[PDB]
Symmetry: C3
């Protein structure tokens, strides 16, 4: 077969199961949902709420970017300098690790999610609680032999559509649903082993270096935010379709680093060379080839993507200021989490030329709160968000706070088993407490008035659920929330 | 679909059940002759080299007669209402509110050596990792769990069996009788165990102060329990024939009503409880039949729910006859239930003629113990009544339960081992009977020196040819160990 | 079907999957292997070191001697004399065991190794760190019942060819490759239950009783060899094709002893009687019938085999010396591990008559470690070997030292995943901390000079390497190996 499907080559028939039609989200009251209330994404024909296109269609629209012409590399000379700085920096900061055994590679894998090609099994189905058996034991078995023999395996990605809460517009307007990349089990265990050591280190380092993954918001926010705060100029950028705009060239460079700084370089070189080679994506009707943009199924995926964000940010910064990348790194503080950034700096940076330099790499930043570039840069770290918490400073120090609407949305809905109609209500949801408490916390940070507003809504539910809830005093949470513990 | 009848009951579908077992677990302990009138394992079907008899399938038909017999009468509505509230209060006051059971804890609570039942009919340990169910029993449970959380309903499929146990020779050589077993679907097994395990646990904890003794130790809780009965003048053991099959779903619901209301998840437990009591589906080889009535004895909860009904049926009779409100009867009586097994102790001056009627009128079948005839007798001693198949005995040291010598003797003549076709076949040394062997001494020593010494005869020999050897204890020495423990 | 495979009757169709065309060995340097260097054994039609006969054919070659006319029985009057003596000695040494549970037996098994007939799954594929489930589970259950019930089962042995390093000739001359019998899990656990107590007894008296199975060369060596040194004359006796040349009649004699010292003898009788009954072997296309020779699959067999050995040897000595076997055995110290023997004795033994006896039994000693015989004996314990170690006569006592040439190899080759070409290099190995150490300590005992040339090789084998380890001093490590712990 061959084969132009959604702008991209065809290679084979798809072994993809048909796109999930049911959602995990459940309204907690039966009340008339407030106007403009976020909602579970489009569900398909079956979705009673609206009459939108096929899920198969929605997926096509999502593939569009991955065939849009790639932008230009950063000037080769500068790129070399940044890769090497980022490397050199890590070399000095990252602690050499023990290699990961098949056991720990398999131990690490989320057993609640799908094995993907070809068994498309929920991983738990084949897990002893130590190693993998049966169908998946054997895929893993072989994926391990192959990794140890430094031999190559084409990975097969299975596409999906993220079930999440979205603005009503995404539903009753132009229907949009966000694309996923379900890795296969073989590939997962291979990259697990390959770059699980390196990733680990990076998480232990997540306060000292700019890749933030593994960072505790409450526990690390104050310090990380105080750090950015030492710097004169702050900025946000709001990349849209970051993932599908990545150049594989750059990804190779991030991979170059990851390999170098992983304990089995010889064997990593393969998995990474594998992970980056024109990628096969099963959309159901066909598997297709995607040569560009980020291939996002793998354990290490988000770190490698962060690593590119770093590279890309520096590349422009250095071009613009024209200062040696390591210098900029000592006149700057960075936070990265995939597409998620906060760039702080003492260097006088030209916001026009910076915007121009990235849009030239093919990126699509925007003005974080007014949707327009050049990217403004304020004298105040307050008003940028990171991890959808907003940066805030009082007389005690800095902290990331979740905003009103998000905490509103978290009360209105709750996880549950899969179902087709999201306004349905399950019985007395028992995993409420441990979360419901945190909600209590995060609202304290908005003070008294609002906290009362939540204090009640909390009482309302939790009573008619498990046992009773202690509703602590506003000032008593603030201390548990800000300080501790 | 079908319908149709088998064993006088509508046919709902074809049977997936495997064929009924033709073997037993009881290997004669020794190669000698069996003493005359000796108990022997129940009939093995076609292939029993002991007697010519019908197909096991036939024995099943016999066993299935009662579930199509007309039900007895509901106890006067008012008293029913009255007794259920009184029983609900007792439990409301006596049960430490337990918290909801998770998937994991329910899965953990299952006896993994019994069958999984329909569909796969597999020994449960087979898809068991040590904590979860994988593969086949994985799918069925994980599906069964989802249906629960969501409050959707399932149709339980039960699988029939015939109890393999020692029976009085007469049930083999005269008219053949082997007892009906129900076996729940792992689907229901897990579902009904979330809904009702917290309750069964609660009840379990509360069993020295509550008449439902499911979970008791005869050694530890026996003395207390029995000494508790003796505070009451009159005693009756008033024992039932065909208990399970006489049950009225109507009452069984009231039983269920209570457990649901008393569960950490009423909303969820209700959907599961309705499912159990719904006209039941029993896989009997060739067909699955609709059983509208009696008790659906598959699931975990079952035996608690069963006793709960027995509570409700005894109370109704007492209130119907004495005409004292159910809280006063219960403050004037000590009850002991376990499914069908029962002691009833009360100071109230109950009319035994009038009582039996009410019971029979509810369609129950009480007989004068294994002494034959009445009206049921009442006595002013507790001595002689028995419970969980031990004799209730009282001495200078308090009350206790004493498995009787006839009963001890058989245990000497039979030992459990793998399934096989000939009951008179003997094993080797069988190197795992020290646990069992010890108990026998204990049991014996409570019958005075004469006896224990002649049980010291046998427990000696059968210790020679065995895995290890220890010396036989002194009487007074072991009796103490037996009476006050440990 | 019917009815002749390499000289032996057909009984049924085989179910054995095909033979491994692959090796587990991998080269450590790409450097061209020295002249006359051992290599993994031949791997058939896809093997590239030569074009030779089918593995099928090679195995037929291995099966030839099972059909050979058996040798003769020792004189009845000498046979019982010994056997009754051996048992009485065990009886005077062995601490009585308590019966092995299913639970215990299921634990014993080498979990990393094929299930045999009929699933042919590696055991690990079905275990829970706990018990066998699924397939093997059921198999394990059934057999256990047939045990307790004292009913019988027909073992179904699977045939294979040992992947090992061999003298290069055995690839480029007359291709040979050693036969293995895979037992079936049923017989496995069944024999484990029946005969595990006995083997355990043997384990814990392997210094006082000639059957050294389970011994530690390092911990137990210095005192086993010390007992040997207490005697005037010592002898290699080196046997060709032990297992093939065996006589079931004697295997039954050792069977009888074993069964006599088992906690549950009646249960054990059966298992033995099966083990010893004409063995059914699964050779791929067909199952055939092996009436003679030692059937080697299950647990037990190695102790069974040594026990036979014990008998055969003790026979020759009584045969020749004319002396009551109690006196022989009290003017002598034996060491048997399978076919590996060492016989120390004070009795003047007529070497001509003695050898003759063994051959008459249908045995096949070669010359100690030279060519042609009459077998020969020395006045010194040095020069003899056992468990592939040269016995050494040191001021600190006696020991086992792995020879120079054996070391060179363990440095030349590394075990890895199964592959097609033995000559490839295992891309930047990890697992050597334990194995590297041991060989560094092996070389310790060969003097200060030899240790140096080794140290260096160890180190460039620690070049592209998982752990950046020290070379400890010679003196230090030599202290470490000899003395322990």
């Amino acid at each position: 077969p061959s084969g132009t499907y959604a702008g991209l080559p065809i290679a084979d028939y798809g072994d993809a199961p048909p796109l999930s039609t049911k959602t995990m989200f459940w309204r907690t009251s039966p009340e008339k949902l407030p106007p403009g209330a976020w909602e579970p994404a489009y569900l398909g024909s079956k979705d009673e709420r609206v009459d939108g296109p096929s899920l198969q269609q929605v997926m096509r629209d999502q593939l569009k970017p991955y065939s849009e012409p790639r932008g230009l590399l950063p000037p080769q000379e500068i790129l070399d300098a940044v890769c090497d700085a980022i490397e050199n920096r890590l070399e000095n900061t990252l602690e050499p690790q023990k290699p990961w055994t098949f056991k720990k590679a398999c131990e690490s894998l989320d057993k609640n999610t799908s094995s993907g090609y070809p068994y498309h099994k929920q991983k738990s189905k084949d897990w002893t609680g130590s190693a993998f058996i049966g169908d998946l034991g054997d895929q893993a078995t072989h994926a391990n032999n192959m990794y140890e023999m430094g031999k190559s395996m084409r990975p097969i990605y299975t596409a999906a559509l993220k079930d999440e809460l979205v603005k009503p517009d995404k539903i009753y307007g132009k229907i949009k649903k966000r694309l996923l990349w379900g890795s296969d089990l073989g590939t997962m265990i291979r990259a697990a082993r390959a770059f699980g050591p390196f990733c680990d280190a990076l998480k232990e380092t997540c306060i000292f270096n700019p890749i933030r993954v593994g960072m505790s918001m409450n526990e690390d926010g104050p310090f990380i935010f105080a750090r950015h705060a030492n710097f004169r100029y702050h900025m946000d950028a709001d990349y849209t379709r970051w993932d599908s705009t990545q150049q594989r060239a750059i990804l190779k460079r991030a991979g170059d680093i990851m390999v170098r700084l992983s304990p089995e370089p010889d064997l990593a070189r393969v998995v990474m060379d594998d992970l980056l080679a024109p990628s096969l994506l099963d959309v159901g009707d066909y598997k297709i080839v995607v040569e560009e943009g980020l291939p996002s199924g793998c354990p290490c995926t988000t770190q490698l993507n962060s690593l590119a964000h770093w590279i890309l940010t520096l590349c422009a910064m250095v071009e613009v200021t024209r200062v040696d990348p390591d210098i900029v790194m000592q006149e700057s503080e960075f936070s990265f989490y995939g597409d998620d950034e906060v760039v702080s700096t003492n260097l006088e940076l030209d916001m026009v030329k910076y915007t121009m330099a990235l849009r030239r790499y093919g990126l699509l930043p925007t003005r974080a709160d007014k949707e327009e570039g050049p990217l403004e840069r304020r004298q105040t770290l307050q008003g940028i968000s990171f991890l959808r918490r907003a940066i805030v400073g009082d007389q005690f120090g800095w902290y990331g706070r979740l905003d009103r609407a998000s905490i509103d949305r978290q009360l209105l809905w709750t996880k549950g088993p899969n179902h087709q109609n999201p306004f349905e209500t399950l019985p007395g949801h028992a995993q409420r407490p441990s979360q419901l408490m945190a909600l209590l916390g995060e609202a304290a940070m908005h003070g008294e008035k609002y906290y009362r507003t939540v204090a009640s809504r909390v009482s309302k539910e939790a009573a008619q659920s498990g046992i009773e809830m202690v509703v602590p005093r506003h000032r008593s949470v603030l201390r548990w929330v800000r300080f501790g513990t």
